[PDB]
Design a protein around this ligand. Structure first.
Ligand SMILES: Nc1ncnc2[nH]cnc12
Ligand SMILES: Nc1ncnc2[nH]cnc12
Lengths: 237, 237
């Protein structure tokens, strides 16, 4: 039972479009009237969950669903900001986590690494088997879309070209891209030992000037591409 | 059924000490082997939950417990860093949230307020009735401990006298104190419409030089004081 987690309705819509046997399920024990969609993708049981934005929304709703259903795999789909320079990163390209970490967590004063939560790795590793399946997709050129595999960084900010961007880069040199939920989901996954992977697509490049405009232009389409890659990964699960 | 939430075992220990009919309950559907304690405080049903540190731990575990039990009230107990100057803030004093907000959430670029999560208030308001009960405790001088009521700020850093401290202050002038979980818990509470309040005690003052030493010295004792105030509030619930 595969949990596909997205932050924004635009991002989840590209997953919800491709569900077979789609049903609306309502969570309401606290009158929250929260709708999730359950269905199938290529014969595999899927829940599409929309969390809202940021670490606490992602953690809160992932946790709810994990409590109420037997989740075997977590896929975090949606948009990402591509940050790594001179490495062929383009808007609409696919970004896949080999690892993820917070850039905005800091108990350095107590000797933990930058981004590291106590008793957890600094870098949550995506599932070995999910990564081999990504390799397969890359090697067989199923998508006419460049795929980058690497470190995705998470924090509760929409990253722009202010000097916020440069200190992240200096803290994690090899970092590929950013998001507002990836390592929150990875932390939840770690706690419940559920294999995870982050599968996003580049909506914008933070270094560039009005990246929020590109972000608005490409959100839906980057969601299309994330969903296509998610579909192909599910084929192999 | 009152959920008392603490981040550190030292903080939860001061709550667990005062539970009557204390039982260990094990959550293990994912082999996480997570222990929570259930009991009574002055005849009122209580779950003491220890989350681990930071926003995602707090959100993840609060969410789990809320899924599995009928929670009527949330109290966030533990230690806090007192930041507001020239207002009689002392180590071991009690800090009570009238409101709480993140200092480290920023979608300003999209026009939201500093700290504000989309579709949520910038400032989560503690429960009106819990606040009146705090007033009662203050007015009747039940504790020989100064109580401050105000804005508590949350983010995923241990706050020190680096210039991190000053930009928080400039973003929220009236701010009283900081913590790493308060507004994460307030966000969860908001989602499930559960009345919350943050009841902490000052372990340290960030402006001062080696505040991490004071934090280590006073963690247990500030936890004692938070627990005493929590007890008195529960008396009135
Ligand atoms: N620039 C950015 N910052 C944070 N999250 C994003 N998701 C897509 N683009 C982003
Ligand atoms: N200085 C500080 N920063 C964050 N959380 C705290 N809890 C107690 N003291 C603190």
């Amino acid at each position: 039972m595969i949990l596909i987690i997205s932050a924004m309705q635009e991002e989840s819509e590209e997953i919800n479009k491709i569900l077979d046997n789609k049903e609306e399920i309502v969570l309401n024990d606290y009158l929250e009237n929260k709708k999730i969609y359950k269905g199938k993708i290529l014969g595999k049981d899927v829940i599409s969950l929309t969390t809202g934005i940021g670490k606490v929304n992602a953690a809160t709703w992932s946790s709810q669903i994990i409590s109420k259903y037997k989740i075997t795999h977590i896929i975090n789909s949606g948009s990402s900001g591509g940050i790594k320079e001179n490495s062929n990163l383009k808007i609409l390209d696919i970004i896949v986590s080999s690892e993820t970490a917070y850039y905005d967590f800091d108990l350095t004063k107590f000797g933990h690494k930058i981004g590291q939560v106590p008793n957890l790795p600094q870098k949550f590793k995506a599932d070995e088997e999910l990564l081999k399946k990504v390799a397969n997709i890359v090697d067989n050129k199923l998508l006419n879309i460049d795929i980058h595999i690497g470190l995705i960084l998470t924090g509760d900010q929409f990253v722009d070209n202010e000097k916020n961007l440069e200190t992240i880069k200096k803290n994690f040199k090899d970092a590929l891209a950013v998001d507002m939920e990836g390592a929150a989901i990875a932390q939840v996954a770690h706690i419940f030992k559920i294999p995870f992977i982050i599968i996003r697509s580049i909506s914008d490049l933070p270094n560039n000037k009005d990246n929020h405009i590109d972000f608005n232009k490409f959100l839906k389409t980057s969601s299309i591409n994330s969903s296509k890659m998610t579909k192909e990964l599910i084929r192999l699960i």
